[PDB]
Symmetry: D2
Subunit: 476 residues, 4 copies
């Protein structure tokens, strides 16, 4: 078989479990054989619409069978898939389509308006039209080092992370090594497949294991609770906010959750209170740390250590290597702070048409996360902060997230930011929404003096749309 | 991490589950951390004994922790491991050591006599001596295309199958894709680790998943039954003969088997009667077809189809491609006979220092199994016979195994062999152990005339040590 | 340097010989310094026009600096170059553009009309020299030797040969190993650069060596002779028909040829007449055999061995392996006929979008030439015919070239071609198509009767049809897609 | 052909120029045909003696056909060649054999005693020419360009540079691109083949081009001159000390040097005296800079640019990238000092069994030269000193070569060396070690007092110790492991 990439997956799965159900969405159920044939038809269709090896095909739409069909079809046509972030403005879609140089944009009816407003040598086709009339799979030569997809990463305009067929395959291998999945898996995907997390951590590994991927086009806590008991979901991925919204809904206590085997949380660390609430209900989080550039898995905190290592990001996935390094590039003394750097077959080729930006951050197979961390005696990592947020005050490092985290012990939302100073170069400045007074004096009971902000401004709201933004700087 | 091969596995597993038990043998229990440190010490030890990248280290001994320690140590030293078949004569050991050019032979006390009789620029050291006094892992550069081990294949002298770190890694990925293993796996290894089957199908995948490998230096049906209930085994690999011996032992009915989740059978097809007996007891066989040259997995018949497709070899493992091909090299019309040929990342680099012999059988990534087969409408394969046993009679193919299989319906053991003929070029000759008469007339009720042997010789015993041999030819 | 491909060549060469003349075209000369600045301006320009890694850029025009600028600019932009046969009509160009999926076409002004008529909605049509951006700093995109450099179309429908950066780099290494080029070469490219021959055998190796490529937009033997003595050409590539026209020109005696060091001849063998005419003016041919799919070098017959091994295609280039194989695939009894099969780092990735057609001719890195040949005890290859021109008649093979060779011995046969035609008795039978000399009269029955004299009856065509002209390539090979016409 | 490595070179070359002389050594000449038969006999012989893929075979002896036979036979047997420094004592050879893990040692008869004293239990000791098997059919084992061809030991303890088949192949491509070699080269190898210079810059490229390698077992300027005029040498490699001894010989005027086309000089820059002495006999040096770990080519200063860019190490070879980097790793303000870092397919796999020492100097395919240098506006490199010879004195850098350069200007300083010596005030301070001319008397205090005249006080050594001779390499570089002696 000449196609070694994701394009071949539907065909390989169909030889193994043709009649097993692969995708559920509204009333739509696709078996593996139905997926293979629908993929082979869209591939031949992209060929006929003039798609050639290395060409980019964008998808603008929600979690939906068309997402996976476009993904596998691209692979089958030797093309590069581009899953757009469906929440972005026209200017931003335009930027993503210009940069990737997409030659075809496949979209769902609800985006038809927005698609018609996009900047003219792009073939914009509604999902289902482009599909052709052969349903025998193409077998084009695709190696694992060939780019499978461009995933745009939000300090500059967005950059396309080049994830190879190899990157996503080896990420799925990592998941199968560290988590226990089976043939009879029923995985609920209510996080977006346009993020590496839903796609890499749950969708692809469930399809590869011959289980069922249940897609929701939207996140609703209630639909997720109903889905869990009605569909007998074994496997869910979410970010803390999605598990917060689920636990907080009226039917949290009423819903039957005995079917859940594996609850994956990524994106950010699970707050202690949230982990405790799921634990109280018999549910333990597997916590993942990762990034787009690692396709995305890097560290796993297993359900056994979730309580024993509170707000650890965990240990390396099997085929990855992870270290904390200085600016010096060398490993730091254990317990000391440095930058998480990642290496392995899951790590990206680079940023699409940005080779210099790539070289700042990728070198000798090692990717710079932009995360400050410590490694404890047991090789468990502890994320401190974003290296970009770091304040330098009389040559001493201040991690806002440490100072912020103390401010939250005070009787809503806060940001600590760097501010020029005539003699220290930079000094802390707390921005707080509440009912006030100068209790920086409380912070002086809690922090190294030099870490305490020298000023505190009260406000009414902060740019907290992130679901906080360092545009707080702009309001110094 | 520069070592991408099996040598790195103990270190990667120890970052993940240090305190979980990896190996049980007599009273010996090794945790992953204990395995990593023991491996790092044997690696440094091999270095100090003058082992350099690409050097061969042989192991002569039974299933035992020293087997895995030598395997991982070789990998860690950038060396090539050579697991000898412990049942072979001195002349045959000599041939395997000459051909591989082993520079170190590590052995267990019981083989000390035999090792002292071996032909003088070989360093012969008992297991445990060579071990050194650093226990920090070496990180030498090892790629997946580097040879991990030489596995000798029984029509000529034995040939060393070069299995790369890549071959064994991708075989383990295949196993994790098609079978459901967990962190809490307890796998019994009473088949020899010097075969690709025990090593590739069970041992490596169980270690990679963070479970426990229970080794028995010998096959005893009784010890296996006791082991299953006393140790709570979830996972067993065997050949039909080993499952035949287990089911036939006094304590078959008495033994508690509720712990068994996955029963793997390989080597040959499970006789209907044997599959039925395990089924009657609630136990379903996953059947594997494979060969040394595929590291070794190729086809899987899952527990769901074990009854529905009796004596099918099954469908391709996910990352493999399998076809029946003519001498013409092309796929054959469905249902027609041809040679199973295998392709994929599990398939060997070639036979050690035999490039011409390799080229007869490996070409464009495709390996010739030497197995005649058919593929049915559902893509399920059916092994007919060994291409080498095929008889050509007036230009028509006779598969002895088909004729033999009819002879076994007659009221012990039989072989059908080719025999020169003045006008047909070759003709059948049945060799039977019983009480006789010429009931080739019964075969004429059952077979195409041209397939019926033209003569039948009765005998007392046949070379049935294989646990039949085409040395029956020699007694034409 | 992250770009290992041809896109990095102008920057690697500008570091060593910045002020040496790289390209001469009439009154225009680029130094290596200027080539690198122009290539980098065009690569930036292409990217501004939406060119991204793997996109296809086509060039329509003759031998021109813009050919080499577009080639190198594509590599620098991580893109794939598509050199179009500039003699094609718009239906054939439409096919090449659609199959390739070119999203940009650069053309010289004489193709403005052809370009206006192309099937194009998502093709940017650009006149050469209108996409030169302000930024002249070389881009350094990650490009490996296994990345595709260009699609070169075959003469079924045209198939796009995927030549990698490695394929073309290793062809140049083959040329440097077997031919003696120096930093003062003055190479005349009067054959088309859209063929592998001029590009791979003369153009790129000369640029690699810091030499001067002299381009002619067209072949005129009179321009070639003026150029050799005026420009002191050291190196020429041509097919035998070019070298014939050069020798049959009135200024062949008066032209100073003393500068000529290396005469490369490919496409077909040099007739004994041709060798003799050049021998007597001191000039010997290095004869090469190759194909598009080997980028293109495979065999060479050097000037030292043209004497004893007459009509040989010669011996393998250093990094290339060459064999004659059975219809099986297995090597043949030495002396007997089989197919030339080629292996090495010069051999293509496969045909673009045509994986099944690729697998029929490319397995285990061995390419099926479609050439029938023998190999002698000395490893010298002898090309007999094209496999697909074979005529099977009562289950015996007939080699038409053996028959055409005999037909040339008959008074007033100026050109001919023997094709397979269906027949119920024999499956196939030969038909001769013969072009008579303008001042010669030929009886069909006498011609056939005379062949029967010379050949086993099974080889002799059953019929003869006369014509004024046969379908010949720009070079002068008979298409044999005159099966269609008779 | 499954062997892509140097092991296949004798068979690839026997196909093209079988009867051309490949190697001449006094009265012995091998044709390419005979080299291939001998290499194949030895490869079979090695395998009979238990040599398998990846095993190490060492050669102890001078420049000799057996060097090249063992090299190519190792490749053909899938094995790794270990060319030992034949000037080493048995403790240093024992180290090289133990670190390499050689399981076979081929030696010429003059090393019979040294070889008898080696620490060996599992080493087969073999006299050259005693492992020639009957089978002369080339083996074709699978060998990739990334397989290790040879371990070349560094001058800590010696480190084994893993040079791949690719590394050495791509060095030869670099040589063919930048130097004008032809099939009639007659290359004199009077420098040792156990160094990368003679092997990679002259020997292998000449064999690739179907030329003749003329080997001398020893360097004697009188033999070199006789050989040039008698053998009509076209190509020579040497370090400046070899070219100095050749020019200071009585038969330099009477020797016909007219055959010389290419003079390659590596190791160190040619003094202005040397260039002038060769200029006046019509001869110009192609000057190369390189190291073992780049197989070894990196920079070249061609004869066309030796005039204006005096003391330059020149510009990068075509397939090699070269930069000056901060202690950071980042490129430096142009004109300022940093370390030469090298990238390209010629750069080694790493040091054998020494992955940590490798990672200190080799990341992202960039190798740290240990050379301090500047680059000018023209991309020409200027080597200043070795990084590890730097003297840090009150946190200021002192370049000893800048100080030794000034010391050479003082009456009767024949040789000298400046080393770092510990000091409590400044961390480090310089000490001069000076060899006086046999007929010169020098006051230490006056020498230092005069340096103070010429240099900032912080650069001037605090002490001077006199000696009769300094530790110099076979070439003539000062070891600087005279730190040990003073
Ligand atoms: N489990 C986690 N714990 C803490 N921070 C995390 C975790 N997962 C992701 N992050 C943060 O989010 C980044 C990933 O960004 P993205 O590629 O957009 O998913 C990481 O580099 C961290 O800064
Ligand atoms: N499941 C199976 N069914 C039938 N034959 C098998 C099966 N597994 C292995 N074999 C046979 O045994 C061979 C493997 O030999 P070995 O490499 O020694 O294990 C295959 O090529 C088949 O001939
Ligand atoms: N020297 C030659 N002698 C005979 N045929 C040749 C020679 N050079 C090229 N050819 C033919 O031209 C074909 C390549 O065509 P093309 O790829 O279009 O250049 C070869 O496969 C041969 O059939
Ligand atoms: N042309 C040259 N000019 C200056 N130093 C050189 C030159 N060629 C070689 N070297 C020095 O020799 C080193 C290589 O030593 P080796 O690897 O033992 O040949 C380089 O790193 C330089 O320090
Ligand atoms: Mg950039
Ligand atoms: Mg053989
Ligand atoms: Mg000029
Ligand atoms: Mg096709
Ligand atoms: Mg033409
Ligand atoms: Mg000679
Ligand atoms: Mg070390
Ligand atoms: Mg020396």
């Amino acid at each position: 078989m000449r196609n070694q990439g994701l394009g071949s997956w539907p065909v390989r799965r169909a030889r193994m479990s043709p009649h097993a159900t692969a995708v559920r969405h509204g009333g739509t159920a696709l078996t593996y054989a139905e997926l293979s044939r629908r993929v082979a038809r869209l591939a031949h269709g992209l060929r006929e619409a003039g798609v050639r090896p290395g060409d980019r095909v964008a998808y603008l739409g929600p979690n939906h069978p068309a997402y996976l069909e476009t993904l596998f079809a691209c692979g089958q046509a030797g093309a590069v898939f581009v899953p757009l972030n469906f929440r972005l403005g026209v200017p931003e879609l335009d930027h993503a389509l210009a940069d990737s140089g997409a030659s075809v944009l496949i979209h769902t009816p609800e985006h038809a308006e927005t698609v018609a407003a996009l900047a003219d040598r792009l073939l914009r086709v509604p999902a289902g039209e482009l599909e052709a009339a052969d349903d025998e799979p193409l077998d084009l030569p695709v190696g694992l080092d060939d780019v499978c997809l461009l995933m745009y990463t939000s300090t500059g305009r967005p950059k396309g992370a080049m994830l190879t067929h190899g990157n996503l395959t080896w990420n799925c291998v990592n998941v199968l090594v560290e988590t226990d999945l089976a043939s009879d898996e029923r995985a609920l995907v209510a996080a977006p497949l346009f993020h590496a997390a839903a796609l890499g951590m749950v969708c692809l590994p469930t399809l590869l294991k011959g289980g069922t991927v249940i897609l929701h086009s939207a996140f609703d806590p209630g639909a997720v609770l109903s889905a869990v008991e009605q569909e007998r979901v074994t496997l869910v991925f979410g970010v803390p906010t999605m598990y917060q919204a689920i636990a907080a809904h009226p039917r949290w206590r009423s819903t039957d959750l005995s079917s859940l085997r594996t609850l994956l949380c990524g994106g950010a660390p699970v707050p202690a209170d949230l982990a405790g609430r799921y634990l109280d209900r018999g549910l333990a989080f597997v916590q993942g740390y990762g990034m787009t550039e690692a396709a995305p898995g890097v560290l796993v905190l297993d359900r056994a250590h979730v309580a024993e290592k509170i707000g650890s990001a965990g240990v390396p996935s099997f085929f990855t290597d992870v270290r904390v390094a200085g600016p010096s590039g060398e490993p730091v003394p254990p317990g000391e702070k440095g930058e998480i750097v990642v290496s392995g077959p899951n790590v990206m080729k680079g940023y699409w048409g940005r080779p210099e930006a790539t070289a700042e951050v990728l070198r000798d197979g090692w990717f710079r996360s932009g995360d400050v961390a410590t490694v404890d005696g047991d090789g468990y990592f502890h994320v401190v902060d974003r290296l970009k947020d770091m304040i330098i005050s009389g040559g001493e490092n201040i991690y806002p997230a440490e100072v912020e985290n103390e401010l939250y012990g005070y009787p809503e939302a806060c940001a600590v930011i760097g501010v020029p100073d005539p003699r220290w170069g930079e000094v802390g400045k707390a921005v707080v929404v509440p009912d006030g007074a100068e209790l920086l004096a409380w912070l002086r009971t809690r922090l190294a003096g030099y870490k305490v902000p020298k000023s505190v401004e009260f406000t009414d709201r902060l740019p907290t749309t992130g679901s906080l933004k360092g545009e707080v700087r702009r309001r110094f």
